[PDB]
Amino acid sequence: TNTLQVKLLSKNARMPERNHKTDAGYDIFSAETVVLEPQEKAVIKTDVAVSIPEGYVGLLTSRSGVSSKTHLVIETGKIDAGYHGNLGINIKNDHEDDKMQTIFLRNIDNEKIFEKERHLYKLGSYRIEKGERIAQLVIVPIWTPELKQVEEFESVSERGEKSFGSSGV
Amino acid sequence: TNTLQVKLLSKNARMPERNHKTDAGYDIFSAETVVLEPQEKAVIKTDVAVSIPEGYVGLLTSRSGVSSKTHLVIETGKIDAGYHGNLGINIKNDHEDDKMQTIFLRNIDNEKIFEKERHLYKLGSYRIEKGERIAQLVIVPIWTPELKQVEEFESVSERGEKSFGSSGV
Amino acid sequence: TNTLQVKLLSKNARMPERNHKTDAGYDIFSAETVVLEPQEKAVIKTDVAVSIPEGYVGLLTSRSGVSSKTHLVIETGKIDAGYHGNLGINIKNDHEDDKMQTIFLRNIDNEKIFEKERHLYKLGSYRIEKGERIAQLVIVPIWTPELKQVEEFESVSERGEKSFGSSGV
Ligand SMILES: O=c1ccn([C@H]2C[C@H](O)[C@@H](COP(=O)(O)NP(=O)(O)OP(=O)(O)O)O2)c(=O)[nH]1
Ligand SMILES: O=c1ccn([C@H]2C[C@H](O)[C@@H](COP(=O)(O)NP(=O)(O)OP(=O)(O)O)O2)c(=O)[nH]1
Ligand SMILES: O=c1ccn([C@H]2C[C@H](O)[C@@H](COP(=O)(O)NP(=O)(O)OP(=O)(O)O)O2)c(=O)[nH]1
Ligand SMILES: [Mg+2]
Ligand SMILES: [Mg+2]
Ligand SMILES: [Mg+2]
Ligand SMILES: [Mg+2]
């Protein structure tokens, strides 16, 4: 216990490491370089596999910096215990496709990228480099009971059926 | 303990079941058939109610397959302990509305749907059938302390106020 | 133990309080008034700081009411233990920018706002008032093991490398 097995699947892969000593998540490095146009979706390889023990789940989620500064949206992945495959980052460039054109790509600091040779890109296009920290992994314990069908619940609650903004705002 | 009460609210409802033995979440079946246009939002009924015990929360979240293959975005729901109402799936078709037209709907495998009779749809429109697994439920334990206002914290940390991409990328 | 330190950073800040007795999250009050145009992104100040103890993470996430009724999308924040800075709400108005114009803003109940003096707004624009509950905070325990590189995992699983809709739909 108190150890997690990690396998690197290629030379493009880098070991997860958490920022601060008491930090929740282990920052994830991209194992490939990808340009994403507006509204373009993709699964980004990390070339990294883990072995989360039973009774736990992994949360492959976004970082506050990247997600707040750019239009790169990462759908939080639920990494099952026993999944030994390549961790994929479920991502979308949710920048609107307004049909505009530029010569500058954006990095994940939302800074314009200057290249020697000039190409035409769709506005709002991003580039992710191999080795950049675009995500992180947080492991939490789960409760996994056997399900039992009932006609009525054992105990009545104060909440009942209240939902979706019932307490208001 | 080690059991969760589940109530089926109609004949359209189906019991949650998890895929693998050590899997984190219980796949959720839609209890209705719905077509969603681009940018259309909805709450999808499961006709299923649960009784998560105190000290736990339910995460009504997305599946990797559906979310990565389609523009169907599910906002992760936080199912409170004691909520005995109908579990609703908070969903949006975030496909852009470009005013294009087609005769093919898409399923949640993003495959074109062929019908005998031909209708005109907005491009990027999806159809969810009753009985399809569009989501899953993961239960985790929560910490629920009493709050105490302070002027200063008891212990100084290494992180302090650092946030939003402070460690960089 | 069983207590969480909370610091209010200004007179605009309000103490987090959970809705029901067994509720998972503590509703978060905005400490500022902001208008968000379509596709506009921002980090919204709460002027509130907490001291989550080691072994835990905070989930600064959305409410079902606001998120389902409006186009205001909150990216779930992972609040590290030891972070004593101002809690920021990572938000985007994902309403499409169709270049339409109106005289009515929308509140976070998606109701049209009537003002004495009439201004022109982009359609799909929202207004968040100081003091409104736009988010909530749920704290869960985390597992934080030391990482160990391996060439192969200790135990073979039933899942293996199966992922992204492998069980189908
Ligand atoms: O996606 C969801 C989210 C929540 N729910 C249920 C469970 C939850 O207990 C209830 C409300 O959860 P929230 O407290 O997170 N939303 P809100 O604060 O707007 O509702 P309320 O005012 O009643 O607390 O609605 C769903 O059915 N689906
Ligand atoms: O929505 C959020 C997310 C995070 N935070 C805070 C808490 C968290 O401890 C801090 C940074 O969290 P992350 O590590 O997930 N983001 P990032 O990796 O970009 O920042 P840093 O480089 O400092 O770790 O910012 C917020 O205030 N709101
Ligand atoms: O973002 C993700 C999400 C999941 N995964 C992995 C881990 C997880 O164990 C696997 C599938 O997770 P889900 O069960 O949540 N998705 P789905 O139900 O569509 O796949 P499957 O049918 O195999 O269970 O894919 C990723 O690599 N990245
Ligand atoms: Mg970080
Ligand atoms: Mg969008
Ligand atoms: Mg699954
Ligand atoms: Mg609530």
Numbering used by the authors:
A (entry chain A), B (entry chain A), C (entry chain A): 2 to 170
Which sentences did the original study use to describe this structure?
We have recently proposed that the trimeric staphylococcal phage encoded dUTPases (Duts) are signaling molecules that act analogously to eukaryotic G-proteins, using dUTP as a second messenger. To initiate the SaPI cycle, a specific phage-encoded protein binds to the SaPI-encoded repressor Stl, acting as an antirepressor. Both the trimeric and the dimeric phage-encoded Dut proteins are the antirepressor proteins for a subset of SaPIs, including SaPIbov1, SaPIbov5 or SaPIov1 (8–10). However, our results analyzing the Dut protein from phage 80α (Dut80α) revealed that motif VI is essential for interaction with the SaPI-encoded Stl repressor, determining the affinity with which the Dut proteins bind to the Stl repressor.
Since motif V is always disordered in the two structurally analyzed mutants (Dut80αD81A and Dut80αY84I), these results reinforce the idea that the Stl:Dut interaction requires the apo form for Stl binding but with the motif V somehow stabilizing the Stl:Dut complex. This idea was partially confirmed with the analysis of the Dut80αG164S protein, which carries a mutation located in the conserved motif V. We have shown in a complementary study that the Dut80αG164S mutant has slightly reduced enzymatic activity but is severely affected in its capacity to induce SaPIbov1. In view of these data, we speculated that this mutant would be able to order the conserved motif V, although the kinetics of this process would be somewhat affected. As anticipated, the crystallographic characterization of the Dut80αG164S mutant showed that this mutant is able to order the motif V in the presence of dUTP, with an identical conformation to that observed in the Dut80αWT protein. In this conformation, the new Ser side chain is exposed to the solvent on the motif V surface. No other differences were observed when this mutant was compared with the structures of the previously characterized Dut80αWT. Interaction analyses with Stl, using BLI, showed that the Dut80αG164S, as Dut80αD81A, had a reduced affinity for the Stl repressor that is further reduced to undetectable binding levels by the nucleotide. Remarkably, the reduction in affinity for Stl observed in the Dut80αG164S mutant, as previously reported for the Dut80αD81A and Dut80αF165A mutants, is explained by an increment in the dissociation rate constant with null or low impact in the association rate constant. In summary, these results support our proposed double role for motif V as the switch and recognition element. On one hand, the motif V conformation induced by the dUTP would interfere in Stl binding (dUTP decreases association rate); on the other, an alternative conformation of this motif is implicated in complex stabilization (deletion or mutations affecting this motif increase dissociation rate).
